[PDB]
UniProtKB/Swiss-Prot annotation:
CDD domains: beta-trefoil_IL36RA (cd23303). This is Interleukin-36 receptor antagonist protein. InterPro entries: IL-1_CS, IL-1_fam, IL-1RA/IL-36, IL1/FGF. It is found in: Cytoplasm; Secreted. Belongs to the IL-1 family. It comes from Homo sapiens (Human).
Length: 147
């Protein structure tokens, strides 16, 4: 694949992981140590490299995060490989996020829906989602680590 394996957490250190094929943020209250889902953070050639466009995938890029096609965005995991996006076999814009590095952490803004950021809620082990409401309770900064 060539993609680098990433473990990521929010700034409150809740781990991003898969449960019933959903991306949850938590895993701090288990007996089992959970390391987190392997995240693919792959740059998008099909957009301008100015605001660091990336596509986020899980399970070795066999599934990718999308913001949908609707009037408002909605975070879902799609059975679309990171390869078919990269090779141009499928439209990638709803799969694209602008990455913003802020010191130790990074934030992800939907390219299809500006102002909407990949976020987590304060409540433990709830689905990762999107928000326009920055600061406050929604966590929009993420730590990144190679596995």
């Amino acid at each position: 694949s060539g993609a680098l394996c990433f473990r990521m957490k929010d700034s409150a250190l809740k781990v991003l992981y898969l449960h019933n094929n959903q991306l949850l943020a938590g895993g701090l209250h288990a007996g089992k140590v959970i390391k987190g889902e392997e995240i693919s953070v792959v740059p998008n050639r099909w957009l301008d490299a100015s605001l660091s466009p990336v596509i986020l995938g899980v399970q070795g890029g066999s599934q990718c995060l999308s913001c949908g096609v609707g009037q408002e965005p909605t975070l879902t995991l799609e059975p679309v490989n990171i390869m078919e996006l990269y090779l141009g076999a499928k439209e990638s814009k709803s799969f694209t996020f602008y990455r913003r590095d802020m010191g130790l952490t990074s934030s992800f803004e939907s390219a299809a829906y500006p102002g909407w950021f990949l976020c987590t809620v304060p409540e433990a082990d709830q689905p990762v989602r999107l928000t326009q409401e920055l600061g406050k309770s929604y966590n929009t900064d993420f730590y990144f680590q190679q596995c």
